[PDB]
Amino acid sequence: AEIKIGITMSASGPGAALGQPQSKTVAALPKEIGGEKVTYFALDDESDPTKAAQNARKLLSEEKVDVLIGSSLTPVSLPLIDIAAEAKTPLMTMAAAAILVAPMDERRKWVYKVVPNDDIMAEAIGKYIAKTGAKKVGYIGFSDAYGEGYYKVLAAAAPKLGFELTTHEVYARSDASVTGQVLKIIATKPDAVFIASAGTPAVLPQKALRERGFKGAIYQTHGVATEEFIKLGGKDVEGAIFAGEAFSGAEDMPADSPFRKVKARFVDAYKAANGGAAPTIFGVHLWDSMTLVENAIPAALKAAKPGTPEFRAAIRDQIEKSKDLALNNGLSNMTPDNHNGYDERSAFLIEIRDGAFRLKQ
Ligand SMILES: O=C(O)C(=O)Cc1ccccc1
């Protein structure tokens, strides 16, 4: 039969600013790959791990999809690892935490990940923060594996880089207030504050810090790299800096940059499918995942027919061989033990300047 791709995304819930762009990207994906028809099955998981697991089981057991893609967020994606592995179906996760694919194990052998691992980003932003002369850095982040991935790496790096983390405050994504946490951070009198958050929930702690009088540097993560964050945040997020993807800095690169080229492809296709509307970065996590899948399909078709475990296993084998590939997410080199594919060369420092994401250095 035709090739079938299943996708679960957080199109509603606190992940909406990530999942909605992904949902709108589906219509831009190719109807034929390697001379074979392709059908997409996309489901909203509502930013809920239980619903994502239900979606995956439905796509795997009922549609027998050849590849599963999702989810948008780390906590939502975690349970999909075991589900995809048990089904011997490759999973292209669209979330960010390193734990989604590293260290390698017998289940993560089935998982690939186009967003650069957060530990790479945390090391990069930590080095930058140190170079500014900051010695005391406050911290607030999500009380989940995404936030904690930033905290643990920054906390380990701190003494080696010459600063100290003054707090370890957390919040849940939908929380109405972080006032208690922010007051605690402010009371430590830090030079700067790090926020580990994603989507529109990332605005709250930054606005709260500014409203409570904090005037120092505020650092965020690539979870904020959507123009929706700039729009909601306004003057309060001006000057935010984070380590992120080539996509976000593409306009401040040479004309022949491969990153401009791969971005143009995506933007043009997205606009054509969405009435001329421009995408935010999160849609590109679906797009780049499909780049890996599309590249693997011709060899897989030589091995087996779609809808068979052999075809899925062939896709898994082929993606692992991907080398020297410019994605919107960076320069990707897969290996048997690294299903992310990036090193520090793909960590770009991005700043919000005059209401736009800009390549900072
Ligand atoms: O919120 C999460 O759990 C994430 O994994 C956030 C994220 C996802 C994709 C790119 C950057 C951040």
Coordinates of C-alpha atoms in Angstrom, one line a residue, residues 5 35 73 79 103 123 146 196 213 241 270-271 304 332 356:
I5 CA 3.1 8.7 8.3
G35 CA 7.5 7.3 -6.6
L73 CA 7.1 18.7 24.1
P79 CA 6.3 7.8 26.7
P103 CA 22.5 8.2 25.9
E123 CA 26.6 24.6 27.5
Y146 CA 12.7 19.9 29.7
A196 CA 14.0 27.4 31.1
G213 CA 12.0 45.6 39.2
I241 CA 19.2 35.9 24.6
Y270 CA 4.3 26.6 4.2
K271 CA 3.1 29.9 2.7
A304 CA 10.6 -3.9 1.3
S332 CA 23.3 17.0 11.1
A356 CA 12.8 40.3 15.9

